[PDB]
Amino acid sequence: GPLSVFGDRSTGETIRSQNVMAAASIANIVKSSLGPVGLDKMLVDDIGDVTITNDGATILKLLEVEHPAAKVLCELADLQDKEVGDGTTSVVIIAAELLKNADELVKQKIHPTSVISGYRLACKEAVRYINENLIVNTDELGRDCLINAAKTSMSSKIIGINGDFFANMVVDAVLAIKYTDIRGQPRYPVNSVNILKAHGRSQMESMLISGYALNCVVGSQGMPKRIVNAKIACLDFSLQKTKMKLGVQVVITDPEKLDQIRQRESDITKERIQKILATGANVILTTGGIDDMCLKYFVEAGAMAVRRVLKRDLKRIAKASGATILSTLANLEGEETFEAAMLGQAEEVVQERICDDELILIKNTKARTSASIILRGANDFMCDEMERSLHDALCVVKRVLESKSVVPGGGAVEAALSIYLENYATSMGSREQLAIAEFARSLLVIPNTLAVNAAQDSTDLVAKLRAFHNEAQVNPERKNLKWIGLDLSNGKPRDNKQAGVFEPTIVKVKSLKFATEAAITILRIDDLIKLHPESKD
Amino acid sequence: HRPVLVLSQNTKRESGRKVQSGNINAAKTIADIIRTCLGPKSMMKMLLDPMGGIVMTNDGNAILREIQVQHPAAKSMIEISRTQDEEVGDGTTSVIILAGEMLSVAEHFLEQQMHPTVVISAYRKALDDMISTLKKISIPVDISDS
Amino acid sequence: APVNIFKAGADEERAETARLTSFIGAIAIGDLVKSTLGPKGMDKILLSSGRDASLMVTNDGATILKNIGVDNPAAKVLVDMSRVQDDEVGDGTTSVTVLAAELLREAESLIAKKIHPQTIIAGWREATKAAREALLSSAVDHGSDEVKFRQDLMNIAGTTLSSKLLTHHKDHFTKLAVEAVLRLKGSGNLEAIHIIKKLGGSLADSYLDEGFLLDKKIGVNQPKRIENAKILIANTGMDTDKIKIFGSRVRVDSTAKVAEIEHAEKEKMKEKVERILKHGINCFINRQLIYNYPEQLFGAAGVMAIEHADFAGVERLALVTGGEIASTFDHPELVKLGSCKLIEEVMIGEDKLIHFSGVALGEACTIVLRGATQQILDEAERSLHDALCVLAQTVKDSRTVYGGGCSEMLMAHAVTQLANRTPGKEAVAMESYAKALRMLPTIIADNAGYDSADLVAQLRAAHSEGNTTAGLDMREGTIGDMAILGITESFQVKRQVLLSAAEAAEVILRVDNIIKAAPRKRV
Amino acid sequence: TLAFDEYGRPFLIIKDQDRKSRLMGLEALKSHIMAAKAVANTMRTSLGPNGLDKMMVDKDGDVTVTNDGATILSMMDVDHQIAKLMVELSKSQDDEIGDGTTGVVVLAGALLEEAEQLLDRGIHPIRIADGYEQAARVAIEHLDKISDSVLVDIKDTEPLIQTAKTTLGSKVVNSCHRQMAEIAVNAVLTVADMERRDVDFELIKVEGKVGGRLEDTKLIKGVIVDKDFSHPQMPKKVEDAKIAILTCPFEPPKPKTKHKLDVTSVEDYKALQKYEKEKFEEMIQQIKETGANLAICQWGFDDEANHLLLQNNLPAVRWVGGPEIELIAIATGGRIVPRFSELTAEKLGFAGLVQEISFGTTKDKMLVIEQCKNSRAVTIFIRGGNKMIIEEAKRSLHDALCVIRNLIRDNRVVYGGGAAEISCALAVSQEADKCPTLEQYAMRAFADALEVIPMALSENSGMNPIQTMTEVRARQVKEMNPALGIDCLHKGTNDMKQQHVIETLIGKKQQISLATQMVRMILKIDDIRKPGESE
Amino acid sequence: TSLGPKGMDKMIQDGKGDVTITNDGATILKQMQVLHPAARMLVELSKAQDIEAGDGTTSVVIIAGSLLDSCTKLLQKGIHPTIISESFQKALEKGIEILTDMSRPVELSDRETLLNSATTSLNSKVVSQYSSLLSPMSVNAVMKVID
Ligand SMILES: Nc1ncnc2c1ncn2[C@@H]1O[C@H](COP(=O)(O)OP(=O)(O)O)[C@@H](O)[C@H]1O
Ligand SMILES: Nc1ncnc2c1ncn2[C@@H]1O[C@H](COP(=O)(O)OP(=O)(O)O)[C@@H](O)[C@H]1O
Numbered sequence A: 001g002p003l004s005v006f007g008d009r010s011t012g013e014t015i016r017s018q019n020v021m022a023a024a025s026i027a028n029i030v031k032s033s034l035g036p037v038g039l040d041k042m043l044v045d046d047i048g049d050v051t052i053t054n055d056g057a058t059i060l061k062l063l064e065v066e067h068p069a070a071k072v073l074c075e076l077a078d079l080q081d082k083e084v085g086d087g088t089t090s091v092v093i094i095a096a097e098l099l100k101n102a103d104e105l106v107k108q109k110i111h112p113t114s115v116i117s118g119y120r121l122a123c124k125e126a127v128r129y130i131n132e133n134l135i136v137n138t139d140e141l142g143r144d145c146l147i148n149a150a151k152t153s154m155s156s157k158i159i160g161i162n163g164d165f166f167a168n169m170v171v172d173a174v175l176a177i178k179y180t181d182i183r184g185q186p187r188y189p190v191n192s193v194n195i196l197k198a199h200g201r202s203q204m205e206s207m208l209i210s211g212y213a214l215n216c217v218v219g220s221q222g223m224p225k226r227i228v229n230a231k232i233a234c235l236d237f238s239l240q241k242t243k244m245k246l247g248v249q250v251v252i253t254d255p256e257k258l259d260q261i262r263q264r265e266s267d268i269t270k271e272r273i274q275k276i277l278a279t280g281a282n283v284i285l286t287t288g289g290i291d292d293m294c295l296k297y298f299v300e301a302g303a304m305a306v307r308r309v310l311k312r313d314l315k316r317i318a319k320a321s322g323a324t325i326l327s328t329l330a331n332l333e334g335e336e337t338f339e340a341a342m343l344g345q346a347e348e349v350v351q352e353r354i355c356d357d358e359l360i361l362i363k364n365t366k367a368r369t370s371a372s373i374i375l376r377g378a379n380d381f382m383c384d385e386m387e388r389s390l391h392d393a394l395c396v397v398k399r400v401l402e403s404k405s406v407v408p409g410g411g412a413v414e415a416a417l418s419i420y421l422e423n424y425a426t427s428m429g430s431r432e433q434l435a436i437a438e439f440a441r442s443l444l445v446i447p448n449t450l451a452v453n454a455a456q457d458s459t460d461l462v463a464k465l466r467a468f469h470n471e472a473q474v475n476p477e478r479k480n481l482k483w484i485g486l487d488l489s490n491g492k493p494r495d496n497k498q499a500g501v502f503e504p505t506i507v508k509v510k511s512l513k514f515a516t517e518a519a520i521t522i523l524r525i526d527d528l529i530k531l532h533p534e535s536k537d
Numbered sequence B: 001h002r003p004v005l006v007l008s009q010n011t012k013r014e015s016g017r018k019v020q021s022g023n024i025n026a027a028k029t030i031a032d033i034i035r036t037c038l039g040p041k042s043m044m045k046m047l048l049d050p051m052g053g054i055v056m057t058n059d060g061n062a063i064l065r066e067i068q069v070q071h072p073a074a075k076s077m078i079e080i081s082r083t084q085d086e087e088v089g090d091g092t093t094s095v096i097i098l099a100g101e102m103l104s105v106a107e108h109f110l111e112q113q114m115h116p117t118v119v120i121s122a123y124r125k126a127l128d129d130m131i132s133t134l135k136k137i138s139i140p141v142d143i144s145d146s
Numbered sequence C: 001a002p003v004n005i006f007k008a009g010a011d012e013e014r015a016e017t018a019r020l021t022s023f024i025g026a027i028a029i030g031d032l033v034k035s036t037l038g039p040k041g042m043d044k045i046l047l048s049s050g051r052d053a054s055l056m057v058t059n060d061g062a063t064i065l066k067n068i069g070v071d072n073p074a075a076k077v078l079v080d081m082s083r084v085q086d087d088e089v090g091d092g093t094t095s096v097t098v099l100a101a102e103l104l105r106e107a108e109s110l111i112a113k114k115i116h117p118q119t120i121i122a123g124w125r126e127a128t129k130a131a132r133e134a135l136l137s138s139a140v141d142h143g144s145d146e147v148k149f150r151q152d153l154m155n156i157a158g159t160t161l162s163s164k165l166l167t168h169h170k171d172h173f174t175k176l177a178v179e180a181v182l183r184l185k186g187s188g189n190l191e192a193i194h195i196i197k198k199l200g201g202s203l204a205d206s207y208l209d210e211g212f213l214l215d216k217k218i219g220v221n222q223p224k225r226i227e228n229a230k231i232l233i234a235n236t237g238m239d240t241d242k243i244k245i246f247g248s249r250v251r252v253d254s255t256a257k258v259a260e261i262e263h264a265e266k267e268k269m270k271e272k273v274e275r276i277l278k279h280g281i282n283c284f285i286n287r288q289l290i291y292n293y294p295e296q297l298f299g300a301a302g303v304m305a306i307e308h309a310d311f312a313g314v315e316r317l318a319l320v321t322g323g324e325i326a327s328t329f330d331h332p333e334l335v336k337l338g339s340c341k342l343i344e345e346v347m348i349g350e351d352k353l354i355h356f357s358g359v360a361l362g363e364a365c366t367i368v369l370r371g372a373t374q375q376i377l378d379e380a381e382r383s384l385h386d387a388l389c390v391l392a393q394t395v396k397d398s399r400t401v402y403g404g405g406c407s408e409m410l411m412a413h414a415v416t417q418l419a420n421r422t423p424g425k426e427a428v429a430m431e432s433y434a435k436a437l438r439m440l441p442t443i444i445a446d447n448a449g450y451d452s453a454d455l456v457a458q459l460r461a462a463h464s465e466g467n468t469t470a471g472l473d474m475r476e477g478t479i480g481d482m483a484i485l486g487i488t489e490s491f492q493v494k495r496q497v498l499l500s501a502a503e504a505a506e507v508i509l510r511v512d513n514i515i516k517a518a519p520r521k522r523v
Numbered sequence D: 001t002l003a004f005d006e007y008g009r010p011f012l013i014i015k016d017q018d019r020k021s022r023l024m025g026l027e028a029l030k031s032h033i034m035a036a037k038a039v040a041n042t043m044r045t046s047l048g049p050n051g052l053d054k055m056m057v058d059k060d061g062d063v064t065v066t067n068d069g070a071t072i073l074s075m076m077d078v079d080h081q082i083a084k085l086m087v088e089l090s091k092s093q094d095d096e097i098g099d100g101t102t103g104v105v106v107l108a109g110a111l112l113e114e115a116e117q118l119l120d121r122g123i124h125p126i127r128i129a130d131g132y133e134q135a136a137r138v139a140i141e142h143l144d145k146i147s148d149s150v151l152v153d154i155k156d157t158e159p160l161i162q163t164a165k166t167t168l169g170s171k172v173v174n175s176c177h178r179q180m181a182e183i184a185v186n187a188v189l190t191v192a193d194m195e196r197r198d199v200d201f202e203l204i205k206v207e208g209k210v211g212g213r214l215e216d217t218k219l220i221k222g223v224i225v226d227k228d229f230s231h232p233q234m235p236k237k238v239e240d241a242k243i244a245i246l247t248c249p250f251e252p253p254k255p256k257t258k259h260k261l262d263v264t265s266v267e268d269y270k271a272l273q274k275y276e277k278e279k280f281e282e283m284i285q286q287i288k289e290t291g292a293n294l295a296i297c298q299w300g301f302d303d304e305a306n307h308l309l310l311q312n313n314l315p316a317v318r319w320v321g322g323p324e325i326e327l328i329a330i331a332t333g334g335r336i337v338p339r340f341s342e343l344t345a346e347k348l349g350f351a352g353l354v355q356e357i358s359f360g361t362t363k364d365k366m367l368v369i370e371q372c373k374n375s376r377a378v379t380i381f382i383r384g385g386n387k388m389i390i391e392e393a394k395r396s397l398h399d400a401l402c403v404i405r406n407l408i409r410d411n412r413v414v415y416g417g418g419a420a421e422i423s424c425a426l427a428v429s430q431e432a433d434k435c436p437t438l439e440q441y442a443m444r445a446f447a448d449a450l451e452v453i454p455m456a457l458s459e460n461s462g463m464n465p466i467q468t469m470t471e472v473r474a475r476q477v478k479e480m481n482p483a484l485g486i487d488c489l490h491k492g493t494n495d496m497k498q499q500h501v502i503e504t505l506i507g508k509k510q511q512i513s514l515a516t517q518m519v520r521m522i523l524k525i526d527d528i529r530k531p532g533e534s535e
Numbered sequence E: 001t002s003l004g005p006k007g008m009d010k011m012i013q014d015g016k017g018d019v020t021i022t023n024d025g026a027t028i029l030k031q032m033q034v035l036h037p038a039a040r041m042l043v044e045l046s047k048a049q050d051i052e053a054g055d056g057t058t059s060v061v062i063i064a065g066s067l068l069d070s071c072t073k074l075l076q077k078g079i080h081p082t083i084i085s086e087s088f089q090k091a092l093e094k095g096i097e098i099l100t101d102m103s104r105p106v107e108l109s110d111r112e113t114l115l116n117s118a119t120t121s122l123n124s125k126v127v128s129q130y131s132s133l134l135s136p137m138s139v140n141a142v143m144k145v146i147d
């Protein structure tokens, strides 16, 4: 008679109501961590680890989910870090409210393919309207655009101070790693900034190290820990005793030739260490291993040798100091040449005190003048929060300098799109106009969440918010009310042009493209079959 | 045996006033443990280790490291005394009492329908004025004198 | 109904295991009692698992099926079929069980031949009608010339007792069974022949008493034997009467009046016995119990007193002495008394029984069965009960047919003669009806150890051209004449074997669905 | 999600919702059809004269072989609420008419099978149910076209016998197809009130005793009770019985209240003996002064009163049931007397041969009343070879007693054997085109389901369903439609008027009416709220 | 409910934990893992449609699910199943001649004919809103590698 599957089958409006409650179970979590009045959470594990964070990606990655519609919204937050980097609480609330308003349409016996086709006409028109209603590029504002866009990202986190201490350190970090490319591409690789953590003084003592901050120790306590006018030798091979390979064995037939082979394992080893040290090299960085026999040659000659450094850290030092990453001997059948003209340069390599640990600093690197940020917090829970908040702040200034276009934040984009799409649904709307009209109400949840978390008036402040944006579209008298946002500290609509509340363009363009595409896949689960777990057979 | 159609299985959810006023009582509980170990008239506190040893001390850092707590906000206060132990020497017991008292007065304003970001923005303005006061009442020291 | 089953603990089957479980459960019943059919068939011993098992050996097919407790649903129809055969004619319960099982065994052969089961029912109804005319036209009546009817009654009892435990006792037990029904001289009540089983002695020591035997010996100080007595029985209360007024007390003012009431109670009990002895009697039988106060009154007057014989004990004494029950003693001129010669007490198996020797109008008998064990006495009682019930109906219906396989070949010949005058749709079902009728002399011939493949073939060749009285001779193992050897059975016994097996096989063959419900307290 | 909210709170609506079962879907209607078709496919093989019986086993182990559709569905352990409505459908046909209990379940399963293909085409289930009401109305009006009977209950019993042969032709009483059919005709007409057209089945006593054969079933005009003569020397045959029916026990009169009668002196105790001695002589003389020679008593007898019956030549029975003596006073024309003082010659019953008959070796000795005088109560004595053939004959002959009752309620007949179902299927197909606006597909599904009952007769008779039905249905359109059906041996031609296959009009009128309304209550349901396990 | 441009997709979550959304009839039946032996033959029917045609997978189950559903009344009319198998072949051989009369001979050089054929198969999937890009890319990926 029925289906003889050994799992479970649920059809109809059961799964159509379960996917909305699965998406609302995720959105109601992250609704309390949006905007400058948002608050952080606690993520406690079974082993006892506590993670205090408010970013939309760190919470949903550590949180376990079971529903298939819940894994779509959790993987939607992971894509926002790679594509944009701060846009990762706002996408989850929009994509869940896109399913909440579309559930009210399919309960009115409206076909979901008209809602899918109605959402594509509203998503492509939202990108078209936001690209024709921008204020200015990065020429008029200058450095004031980079600082004000950085403070908007920090307002939802622990580094949202009233001053410009953390804002100036981010702009000075991205501007110091300007790496040009072919065909006129000024790239800004923000992954080259080594963000370090140390439980020390307050947040106002966060050092901006112009150069690189290596997270390693010297090793042997007989080397000079401060070298002025240093020459960095970046190399990746273990400075240990000469061990033969698997194909080579030592089969001796004469007992007199025994001790000459035993001394040869250290003579070939020390032959490399004398030709890399006679060329003026004082700092040697190694990703392999330097044993206790080879540490004597640096104490005797007065050189610094750092062992077991990361491979991702050696590439950031050799590119910034002009050093060449050498793995072995080379240069056309040469015995030991080392190409001594390709040594790195540094002004000062100094191991400072980082509150009961050792940290090596390189000052200005003499070739590229890179930057590294050492964070200072109260405990380890604040340092993990300060690292995530700084990494999201580095991604904001990266997209502004690459794509010179900013949009007003604080719900100013979602207020203008809530009224333009209602007029867009009336012109060319015959049967898909109800999906475009619900696309505007789903976008209004971003200024609605700012009024809930601020404990302000909800149905009056957003009603006063769209009152200025309606007059900016139907009354062409140059009212300039396209930048009207929210003042959550006062509870009144303010102008985000003069207040300095700036967000990048692709933090809302890619947010509206990812949330609309995720809402289509969850809208097509009218039939769902769940099989039994095959564990013990 | 059919499985129950749930979401986020075997985890807890807690929000509202029970977390804001719940982390204050966890901070007041640790500050009452080492409250009798600040003045010169203090007393030792005999502790017992899982290895079988005995730690009889009155220092604020060595007491909190021997306490295994289950509350998440109580685990934050133990890492505060570990930070004060590595930076300075005798900066332990004073921070745990002071952070419990700054959160004691912070619980009063959370009942007055005030946002927690208003208290923190007032705490950061107060922190910048406490550093400037200690530098005015300081005194230079002759380090060459024995 | 198996697909998407809407039952809780009940199961069912339709046309696949329905006729499969019906044909397995019915043949295994008929193959069980197959070894007990005929004059040379063995017997069964029935036993339980414990808790007063009470082993009871029986050769009759009704007593075997009523105690086994078959769990098969279609097998209970053949169990209930043999129960009616024991209650109506008292014989042929084994013959009706094998015949109803051989019909369904031939119907199982028609499964692979793709014959419709309603065609087999319509083919067997015409076969049963042809078999009724074979027994009716071959029945031998007996009116006058009573010296041939008493010889015919000994052939009925000799045929019934030959298939039982009384094998080498036909010279005695035939006279004990014929003369018991011959002394009834009326209706076959089948309760005046009281069978008393006593241990000790052989079956040849058993006899038919000329009078009547009883228990509950004569009083304490009363005479044990009175010659030429007048027997008066009763069904009244003697002492502690509490006579029919519920809610009557003795409310007096002093204890001297209680002594006057209890003396007045014993005077009315004495006056009741004085009304009994005005008839001029010497023996007294009461169905109820006689206490000590009227027992002294009968002992002082020289009158016997038999107290609490049986509820049906006063009925047999009323038929063997020629009196009446007489529960009220107020008219001595309207109470008929019994008659006897000797009321001496005899001792049978170290037990003193009251022998009513020399009674007049003795329409009741007493068979004193004596056997080696209790298992023989329980078998010989049922063997005599299977012989007295046929003779009680042979005197009501004097039509007799020739048994010993002769009646079955006459019935099978009439079906085969009409099977050739029918079209091929129903002629195959009629040939299976005639083959099952020939199985009944085949079971009898093979139980002795004879060549059953040739003796039934000689019976079929004999009945095909004359020889209406030719049957199976189990004495020497050949074919002989049944009128010469004297092997006859009753017409109503052989009709109920044919008719009840044809009706019971009609019910089971028409079943295409066995829907059994969920039983209680079975997990 | 279920049992949890989006805010983390437990979401409990009803108690024990984890062990519940709820289906709305599109398979909730599909689960009702597949549960009802398996009941209709079971009852399809037991339809018609070639219908095979079913073996039913009770919970106690008792086995009853039944063929009527009322007792088959009633003795099941089906715990399915859709199939439980099919049990009450066959019970409602038995309580009202009592002939088509098998055909009303195959017809209801046929309407649901045709509605399964109509459900996949997008038709609403109430729109199919509203289309079946407009289609069953045509089948009622077309069934009243040819209907006539000439029953006068005097000498024209020939339409009454042939009507009962159609009901008894499908049962196991076909060996007594002419004998037992005449029993059920004369049993109704002697007890029915023709002035009110009302038949009371309490006057028709149906008794059964094992032994004999099916041909020994006789219609005893009178009563058959278990005779309990307290005296074994009582005469077992009364030629002319003046029956004295009484309801007082043969005893001194005991009151209904607490008495505690006081005895003081010995003159009061001697007065107790003379009170009871004259009471037993008064209760015996008051019967003999009326001229009675037979007594019936509901309660027991005393031992002192037993011998006074034999001295006065007055046979009497003991411990008769409640409604048993109610049948004696109607069959004999007497009156039931409460006391002994109210006995008279006018309250006596009249009967002829009053005797007891012993059956084989048993000790039952039932009463046989041969002669009577204008009795309004008869008793059918069913005999057989076993209890399986008797309890079925009690159910088979009860269906024959009901079809004669339906002829007195309505003297219009039809012709069975599938002839009325093919003729009614042509009436719905002719009115499906007048007009085919909305309910065209619902009426054609009704006409295709009415043809399942005659094609089930062709399947059980070994013929082909679609070959035989196409021949019979085409002959009713080419000419005027006769009584044209089918049979098992086919009796030569297929004319039901010549084969005398006669069924009642109101029997088939309630087959279409009850199956349509039961389909409407199982089509107008879109949810099931059954629980899970038992405990 | 997964057929046509107005059809919805199905999501099958297996016992391992790899839940995928699928609309093609071949991919649905291979993930359902039906235990009934007669229903597993319908899974292999949609598998060979994916091999031979590639675009006949959901429709081969609607036809075979209805041809057996039409045999429900045919088996209740005394018709032998060998007679139904002979008549289904006569309807199959006459069915190809009807579809051949509706066919129009086209040429692979016409890009507008190949574009409208690929756009029809994309209307039932999730990429029906992306048929302005995927359907031109499906034709150009084929007609440049076939010669
Ligand atoms: N000063 C401010 N005034 C008003 N709104 C603000 C201000 N600063 C930030 N916001 C709002 O807070 C929101 C924070 O979003 P966020 O959680 O950072 O997104 P994501 O999770 O993608 O990084 C932004 O959408 C922005 O509109
Ligand atoms: N003689 C004294 N008179 C008054 N106060 C004192 C005296 N000696 C110590 N104290 C106070 O006792 C406190 C002890 O602090 P302590 O617990 O040692 O801090 P930490 O835990 O950082 O070492 C100091 O803050 C100091 O002001």
Ligand SMILES: Nc1ncnc2c1ncn2[C@@H]1O[C@H](COP(=O)(O)OP(=O)(O)O)[C@@H](O)[C@H]1O
Binding pocket: C036, C037, C038, C039, C060, C061, C062, C085, C090, C091, C092, C093, C094, C095, C096, C158, C159, C160, C162, C163, C403, C404, C405, C444, C472, C473, C474, C487
């Ligand atoms: N002397 C004899 N010669 C031939 N056949 C005999 C003789 N005595 C008995 N039989 C056969 O043995 C069979 C015994 O049947 P039985 O078991 O008594 O049937 P049931 O159990 O119904 O009484 C009879 O059918 C009879 O034909």
Ligand SMILES: Nc1ncnc2c1ncn2[C@@H]1O[C@H](COP(=O)(O)OP(=O)(O)O)[C@@H](O)[C@H]1O
Binding pocket: D046, D047, D048, D049, D068, D069, D070, D093, D098, D099, D100, D101, D102, D103, D104, D166, D167, D169, D170, D399, D416, D417, D418, D457, D485, D486, D487, D488, D499, D501
């Ligand atoms: N001689 C016959 N020829 C053709 N059909 C017959 C004949 N006798 C009975 N039938 C059919 O057999 C069917 C038996 O129906 P039945 O099961 O008795 O209904 P119910 O269960 O309501 O009593 C009737 O509908 C009738 O048409």
Ligand SMILES: Nc1ncnc2c1ncn2[C@@H]1O[C@H](COP(=O)(O)OP(=O)(O)O)[C@@H](O)[C@H]1O
Binding pocket: E002, E003, E004, E005, E024, E025, E026, E049, E054, E055, E056, E057, E058, E059, E060, E120, E121, E123, E124
């Ligand atoms: N634009 C359209 N208008 C109407 N019907 C369409 C359109 N596009 C596709 N269809 C229908 O959708 C159905 C999709 O069938 P499909 O599931 O692709 O079959 P298969 O599983 O064999 O590939 C086709 O039968 C087609 O008739």
Ligand SMILES: [Mg+2]
Binding pocket: C091, C092, C159, C160, C163, C386
């Ligand atoms: Mg015998």
Ligand SMILES: [Mg+2]
Binding pocket: D099, D166, D167, D168, D170, D171, D399
């Ligand atoms: Mg009938």
Ligand SMILES: [Mg+2]
Binding pocket: E055, E120, E121, E122, E124
């Ligand atoms: Mg397709």
